[PDB]
Amino acid sequence: NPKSDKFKVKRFHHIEFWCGDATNVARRFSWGLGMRFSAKSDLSTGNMVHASYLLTSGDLRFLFTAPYSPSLSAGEIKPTTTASIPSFDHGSCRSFFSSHGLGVRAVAIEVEDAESAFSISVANGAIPSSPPIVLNEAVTIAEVKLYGDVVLRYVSYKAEFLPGFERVEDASSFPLDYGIRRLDHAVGNVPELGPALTYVAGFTGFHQFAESGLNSAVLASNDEMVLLPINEPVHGTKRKSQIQTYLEHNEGAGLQHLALMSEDIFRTLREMRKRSSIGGFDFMPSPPPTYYQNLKKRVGDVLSDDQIKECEELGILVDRDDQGTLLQIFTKPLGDRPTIFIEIIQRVGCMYQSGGCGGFGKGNFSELFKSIEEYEKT
Amino acid sequence: KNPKSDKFKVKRFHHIEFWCGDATNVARRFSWGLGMRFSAKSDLSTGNMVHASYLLTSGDLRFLFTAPYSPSLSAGEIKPTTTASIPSFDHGSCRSFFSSHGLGVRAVAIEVEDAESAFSISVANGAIPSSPPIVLNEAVTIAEVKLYGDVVLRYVSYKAFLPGFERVEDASSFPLDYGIRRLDHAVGNVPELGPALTYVAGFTGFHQFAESGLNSAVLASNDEMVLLPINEPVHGTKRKSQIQTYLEHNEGAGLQHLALMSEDIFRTLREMRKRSSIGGFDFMPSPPPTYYQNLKKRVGDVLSDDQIKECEELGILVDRDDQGTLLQIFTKPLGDRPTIFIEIIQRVGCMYQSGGCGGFGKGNFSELFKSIEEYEK
Numbered sequence A: 001n002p003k004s005d006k007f008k009v010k011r012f013h014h015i016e017f018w019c020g021d022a023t024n025v026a027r028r029f030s031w032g033l034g035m036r037f038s039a040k041s042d043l044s045t046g047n048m049v050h051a052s053y054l055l056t057s058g059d060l061r062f063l064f065t066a067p068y069s070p071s072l073s074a075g076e077i078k079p080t081t082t083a084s085i086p087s088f089d090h091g092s093c094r095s096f097f098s099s100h101g102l103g104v105r106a107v108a109i110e111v112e113d114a115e116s117a118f119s120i121s122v123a124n125g126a127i128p129s130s131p132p133i134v135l136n137e138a139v140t141i142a143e144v145k146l147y148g149d150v151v152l153r154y155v156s157y158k159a160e161f162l163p164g165f166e167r168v169e170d171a172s173s174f175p176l177d178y179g180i181r182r183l184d185h186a187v188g189n190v191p192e193l194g195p196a197l198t199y200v201a202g203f204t205g206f207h208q209f210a211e212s213g214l215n216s217a218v219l220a221s222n223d224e225m226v227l228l229p230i231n232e233p234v235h236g237t238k239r240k241s242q243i244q245t246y247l248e249h250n251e252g253a254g255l256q257h258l259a260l261m262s263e264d265i266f267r268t269l270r271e272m273r274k275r276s277s278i279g280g281f282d283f284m285p286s287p288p289p290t291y292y293q294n295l296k297k298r299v300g301d302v303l304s305d306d307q308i309k310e311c312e313e314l315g316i317l318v319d320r321d322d323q324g325t326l327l328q329i330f331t332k333p334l335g336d337r338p339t340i341f342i343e344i345i346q347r348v349g350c351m352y353q354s355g356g357c358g359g360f361g362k363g364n365f366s367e368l369f370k371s372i373e374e375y376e377k378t
Numbered sequence B: 001k002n003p004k005s006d007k008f009k010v011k012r013f014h015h016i017e018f019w020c021g022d023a024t025n026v027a028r029r030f031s032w033g034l035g036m037r038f039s040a041k042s043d044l045s046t047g048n049m050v051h052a053s054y055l056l057t058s059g060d061l062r063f064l065f066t067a068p069y070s071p072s073l074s075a076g077e078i079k080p081t082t083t084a085s086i087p088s089f090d091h092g093s094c095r096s097f098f099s100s101h102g103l104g105v106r107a108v109a110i111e112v113e114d115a116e117s118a119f120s121i122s123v124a125n126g127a128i129p130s131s132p133p134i135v136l137n138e139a140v141t142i143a144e145v146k147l148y149g150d151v152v153l154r155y156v157s158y159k160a161f162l163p164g165f166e167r168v169e170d171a172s173s174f175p176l177d178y179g180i181r182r183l184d185h186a187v188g189n190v191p192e193l194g195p196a197l198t199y200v201a202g203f204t205g206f207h208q209f210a211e212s213g214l215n216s217a218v219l220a221s222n223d224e225m226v227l228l229p230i231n232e233p234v235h236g237t238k239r240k241s242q243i244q245t246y247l248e249h250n251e252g253a254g255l256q257h258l259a260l261m262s263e264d265i266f267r268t269l270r271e272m273r274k275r276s277s278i279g280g281f282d283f284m285p286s287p288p289p290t291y292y293q294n295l296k297k298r299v300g301d302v303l304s305d306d307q308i309k310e311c312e313e314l315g316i317l318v319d320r321d322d323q324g325t326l327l328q329i330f331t332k333p334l335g336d337r338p339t340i341f342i343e344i345i346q347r348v349g350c351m352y353q354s355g356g357c358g359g360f361g362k363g364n365f366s367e368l369f370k371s372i373e374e375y376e377k
């Protein structure tokens, strides 16, 4: 932890999906994850350009944007636009979606100064995507390129999401909550890790944090509350690499998965599993019971025997660090393309609680293989 | 006067196809918001490299949701070797349709007894073809002519869902059911009614069935079970027509609303309004109480005092025919644009029921302003 950040970062701010129709994705995600409609920006708020809806659960902010017809905004140019998020662009958005499907366009981090952060990033090698723009003399926004067509976004405050969003009338946004509270890491899939790590730790000063189809490294902020792992494929293997399958169906580099921190992963999983076949997110097939017998041998000090039996009801995977213990599970893909998916996380130990306590689960690749071959022979 | 002039044999509505950016998310939203089962699929998991297509069903109502993959996936596929289950599909036409109109209905699909002859007769009677007949396996034939806008009227026929779909695996298949049972009418908006009603009646032989800013007429098959109303705008000088607003945000003509018949509209509305703000569909703001104080005067012989009470709690609208009575309600738009919406209906009268029983609600245009004036006082 050299604390080598070239500017000051203070946690994730929001994840932005670009969609064909934003109403329907946001309503599916709302119900599937227990997130509340909190802010809107569309025709009803005087936006002729895009429709945008903010979901929030705790500190997690999911935003969903689709474009209107360009005719609607035909008498506007870029400085005269009615758009509340002025880095938007019809042709980029339709291009992004036609190429990659539904997915993440913007990983947005809060920084002390966005203007600064943009200047310091390009001067250390970052490809600019959107210059610094300020909203109603309060919030500043900027975009540099991250990987694929996914930008890293800088929100800064001078002195209720962004200006020109309206707070959502509480008679249409029902208090939903299944326990999700934070974005914990955002991960990207790429063809060559070396080049992507070199470029991205270059313009941020993020440090590196402490096969079965992939190689992976994590980039971290000074306090290690922003975590950005990146994977590449390992080819020729017995099975074909899931990383490789992503890149094919995504047409290149992109955001693989988002990991959401739960203040009670068992509450979250129950609520989510309850709604899988009625509009929410399905889950990966749960591991065999041999994986859970082996659990007492590796985490029996951390989890009681009943809690282990409740992991097994829910299909939870468990891995352990030098510092803490990780509880994790993975959804099936969120969209039509086998590309992006969600992972639900609770961390245990390392006490605020440090970021990364428990790792990221890599030990669970090997573990499963073993547990599935022990099961298939008895 | 039902002149029974169908230029070919027509059974009932078969399904509706939406074209979307992401099939998965639309279908799960609609399933939950409407009470429809996940019952069939065609996608990568079943060998379709071209499009994803998911099918929700409630009774005889079938909603299909379809989106395109990256073309890279099927680049060495020609039409004879296609893994597409719906051969009229076309990456360009979908992506084009969707950026011009957003989320919307591409295919109103009626089931015929022979689709090759339905297509031929239609095209021999003014129908502009969109897809000439393709034979799937050797069980089902499909053909598409132009309807209005980029919406096609699709002909399905059977010798005895579609080949290449699989049944949904029970675990993923939740038997949801809020009471909806079939599609009752399908309505388009066009800028000129006259050309559109001539074109469509010309190649079908459908017959006519018999201001607030719109003009419309209704085409129907011989038994009047397929119903096709069409609205045009009445442009004037007092208010901007709502039909014109549709045309602008849709970028021209398309399908305005689907009318979904419930076997028990009170139950359906109950379950839909429970889910409105947790993933489902909102509804248009409800009429003023003066509208419901006036209900017993007009249908006090059809609905009990208790059942009028339940209309008002659910915000339902009532209209009366020369022959029957109609319960109806309208959602807000299904997607980002102020274009397509859904209407839930149930008809009472005309005893098997005969189609269009009770009309289509035109009485409620003046019934509503009449109540808006009274509520003020």
Ligand SMILES: Cc1c(C(=O)C2=C(O)CCCC2=O)ccc2c1C(=O)N(Cc1ccc(C#N)cc1)CC(=O)N2C
Residues within 6 Å of the ligand: A185, A187, A214, A216, A229, A230, A231, A242, A257, A284, A317, A330, A331, A332, A333, A334, A338, A339, A340, A341, A343, A360, A361, A362, A364, A365, A368
């Ligand atoms: C992605 C992932 C991570 C993960 O978090 C990640 C990082 O955070 C940085 C370190 C490197 C890395 O791998 C950790 C464990 C993991 C997966 C995983 O992916 N799958 C398969 C899997 C297939 C298909 C879908 C879908 N849809 C989801 C997961 C299977 C599995 O057994 N385990 C245990």
Ligand SMILES: Cc1c(C(=O)C2=C(O)CCCC2=O)ccc2c1C(=O)N(Cc1ccc(C#N)cc1)CC(=O)N2C
Residues within 6 Å of the ligand: B185, B187, B216, B229, B230, B231, B242, B257, B284, B317, B330, B331, B332, B333, B340, B341, B343, B360, B361, B362, B364, B365, B368
């Ligand atoms: C469309 C429609 C029909 C309808 O079904 C139809 C046919 O079946 C064929 C004959 C003519 C026709 O109009 C019947 C009644 C009706 C509407 C209607 O549309 N709206 C406004 C309305 C605005 C915005 C939205 C939205 N979003 C939905 C409805 C308002 C209203 O008071 N009433 C009473």
Ligand SMILES: [Co+2]
Residues within 6 Å of the ligand: A185, A187, A257, A259, A343, A360
């Ligand atoms: Co992870």
Ligand SMILES: [Co+2]
Residues within 6 Å of the ligand: B185, B187, B257, B259, B343, B360
């Ligand atoms: Co109607």
